Amino acid sequence: VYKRPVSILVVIYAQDTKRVLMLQRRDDPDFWQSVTGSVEEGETAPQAAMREVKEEVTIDVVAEQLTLIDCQRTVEFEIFSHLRHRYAPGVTRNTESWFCLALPHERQIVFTEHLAYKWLDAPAAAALTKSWSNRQAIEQFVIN
Ligand SMILES: [Co+2]
Ligand SMILES: [Co+2]
Ligand SMILES: [Co+2]
Ligand SMILES: [Co+2]
C-alpha cells in the first residue's frame, strides 16, 4: 500500500552519554536513521511518534514514564528516488515533524523494522545518516 507523505522523526539519545541510537534500514541497508514513520489517518503527530517508538524499538513511553518532546520543527524534503515507488503517483515531497526522546542510559534494543542498531556519539550519528533532516535534528537537539 502507499506510504503517507506526512511523517515523524524521533531522535532517541541517552542523557548520560549523549550517544544517539541509529538503526539500519531493511529496504536500504546503507541507510542508518533515528526512528521515522508515517502519520496515519486519524492520528496526530505525537500519537504517531509514540506508536512508532513502541513498534520500532519496543520502548513504551507511557508505561516507562519517559517524556516524548515535540521539537516544534517541521521540514519538507524530496523523497529519495529509489524509495519513492512506495508513495502514490506524483508524490515526491515528504513533510516531517521532529521529536526528541531522552533515555536515562544507553540500553539494549529489540527492533522490528530494521537490520541492526548502534549507539554513536552525536556527530558520528549525524555524519552517518543519509537523511539531511535526521542529521540536522541530531545537530540541533542532541549536540546543541
Ligand atoms: Co520507520
Ligand atoms: Co509506520
Ligand atoms: Co515504522
Ligand atoms: Co511502516
From Swiss-Prot:
Per UniProt, the cofactor note for this protein states: Binds 1 Mg(2+) ion per subunit.
Q: Which residues bind substrate?
A: K3, R25, T36, F77, E78, I79, F80, S131
Give one Pfam family: NUDIX
Top enzyme category:
hydrolase
Q: Which GO terms describe its biological process?
A: AMP biosynthetic process; ATP biosynthetic process; folic acid biosynthetic process
Q: Motif Nudix box: which ranges? A: 37-58
- Top-rank taxon of the source lineage equals Bacteria
Q: Where is the Nudix hydrolase domain?
A: 1-142
Q: Which InterPro entries match?
A: DHNTPase (IPR003564), NUDIX_hydrolase-like_dom_sf (IPR015797), NUDIX_hydrolase_CS (IPR020084), NUDIX_hydrolase_dom (IPR000086), Nudix_hydrolase_domain (IPR051325)
Q: Which Gene3D superfamilies match?
A: Nucleoside Triphosphate Pyrophosphohydrolase
SUPFAM superfamilies for the chain: Nudix
What Gene Ontology terms describe what this protein does at the molecular function level?
A: bis(5'-nucleosyl)-tetraphosphatase (asymmetrical) activity; dATP diphosphatase activity; dihydroneopterin triphosphate pyrophosphohydrolase activity; metal ion binding
**Where do the annotations place Mg(2+) binding?**
E52, E56, E113
Cofactor(s) recorded for this entry are: Mg(2+)
Name the UniProt key words of this record, in alphabetical order: Folate biosynthesis, Hydrolase, Magnesium, Metal-binding
Listed under catalytic activity are:
7,8-dihydroneopterin 3'-triphosphate + H2O = 7,8-dihydroneopterin 3'-phosphate + diphosphate + H(+)
Q: What is its EC number?
A: 3.6.1.67
**Similarity comment text for this entry:** Belongs to the Nudix hydrolase family.
The record's function comment reads:
Catalyzes the hydrolysis of dihydroneopterin triphosphate to dihydroneopterin monophosphate and pyrophosphate. Required for efficient folate biosynthesis. Can also hydrolyze nucleoside triphosphates with a preference for dATP.
Q: What is the protein name given in its UniProt record?
A: Dihydroneopterin triphosphate diphosphatase
Organism of this sequence:
Escherichia coli O157:H7
